[PDB]
């Protein structure tokens, strides 16, 4: 398991009539546990997160503890092939490329 | 409870020698549940989140379901008063001001 | 001479509450790290803040 870090998650796109390029659609996702003090490889925490962690350590019990989530994304392009028409589409904010707990 | 939104959370800053201004330190927190289809008041979801929600709906079981987290911050200024010295500090990324689940 | 009187006044004005339940936690400020022109503008800022604080 280890600390908050990125990992693979992919699917396959299928159509009954046309053919899609690329086939394997890749969209990563991260998982793990980020604790106090930090033992990670991503940038340093913010002030909000350290405040929440200290509140937790003192003895309180929060209703929404910190979580590992993404903070950056990248776009993608798809091509659909069929007789009498070849089409292309571009969609932004599809692939995760960096993440850290907030 | 309701859906993902912003809520109040504040503390008191105390010092044994100097006096701090302002006293009550305010730092809101994001809390709630975001589902499918969206019934919220924040901006529309991204493509990653809808992909994850559809994966969950089909029958899969993810190891890290989407969570309500903040996405913006603001700085703050503090003043410390004591004999022979009045000091001021500015710290960024302290107060949460928006929510949206990722 | 002058600032100490301001500190005493600020301490005096902060009267304790009379509510029967704790409003929130208290935490010391220790680990969220960052003709004098200082003592000139800082006091202006402090008085501006006290203006809003005292109305409560």
């Amino acid at each position, epitope marked *: 398991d280890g600390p908050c870090a990125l990992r693979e998650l992919s699917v396959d796109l299928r159509a009954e009539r046309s053919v899609l390029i690329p086939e394997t659609y890749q969209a990563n996702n991260c998982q793990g546990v980020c604790g106090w003090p930090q033992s990670d490889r991503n940038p340093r925490y913010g002030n909000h997160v350290v405040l929440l962690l200290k509140m937790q350590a003192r*003895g*309180a019990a929060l209703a929404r503890p910190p979580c590992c989530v993404p903070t950056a994304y990248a776009g993608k392009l798809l091509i659909s092939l069929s007789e009498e028409r070849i089409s292309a589409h571009h969609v932004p904010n599809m692939v995760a490329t960096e993440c850290g707990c907030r | 409870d309701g859906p993902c939104a912003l*809520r109040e*959370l504040s503390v008191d800053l105390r010092a044994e020698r100097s006096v701090l201004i302002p006293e009550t330190y305010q730092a809101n927190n994001c809390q709630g549940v975001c589902g499918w289809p969206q019934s919220d008041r924040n901006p529309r979801y991204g493509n990653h989140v809808v992909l994850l929600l559809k994966m969950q709906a089909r029958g899969a079981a993810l190891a890290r379901p989407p969570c309500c987290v903040p996405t913006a911050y603001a700085g703050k200024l503090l003043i410390s008063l004591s004999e022979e010295r009045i000091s001021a500090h500015h710290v960024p990324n302290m107060v949460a001001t928006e929510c949206g689940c990722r | 001479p002058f600032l100490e009187t301001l500190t005493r006044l600020v301490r005096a004005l902060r009267v*304790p509450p009379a509510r*029967a339940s*704790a409003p*929130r936690l*208290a935490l010391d400020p220790d680990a969220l790290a960052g003709g004098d022109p200082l003592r000139a503008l800082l006091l202006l800022k402090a008085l501006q803040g006290l203006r809003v604080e005292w109305r409560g």
Partner: antibody
Amino acid sequence: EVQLQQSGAELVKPGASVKLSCTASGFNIKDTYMHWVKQRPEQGLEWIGRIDPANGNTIYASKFQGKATITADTSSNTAYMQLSSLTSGDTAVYYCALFITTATYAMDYWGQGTSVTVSS
Amino acid sequence: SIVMTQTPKFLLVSAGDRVTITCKASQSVSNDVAWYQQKPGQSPKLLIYYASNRYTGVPDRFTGSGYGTDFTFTISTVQAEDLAVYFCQQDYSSLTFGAGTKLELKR
């Protein structure tokens, strides 16, 4: 962690006074108030009073006024309650408590209970 | 002072039923309420604070709701480890601790 420790059971004559104690551990009492609670076998729970160690301002209920004195000492993280003018109706169990409830977080800690008996 | 009335005063379940308890107030108490639990020979322990949140370690069976002047606390599927007495507390003024409700099983 946090732990609240109390004294042992006591038996007193009908007309004397008692002094119960409650000491914290792994915590600083200056952070928040301390409450004292009473319980009778069948009358249910009740509220006696609270103290604020930082300033020394204490609050008592409208029924226990004049026969219960709460004091605190932060040099060793301890609180005392003096109960006076016993009348054989105070035989009960007393608790030391810390309460905080807020829209986003909460904290609730209780003692172990001290039993007080009045008989001749 | 605010007076809190709790019902029912007694109960009896069959280890598979659903349970509901009501705790009405004598005056507008906003949404400051707490639901506790006390087993024999032990000190109470918080279960629900404010009006809907859950303390750490509480399973998903327990839940509560209400606002203004009516508050309710319900358990979905009773088990054999839920024999205790339940109280409702308010905090808008000098604290008051309800009256208490018992519980029993069948066989």
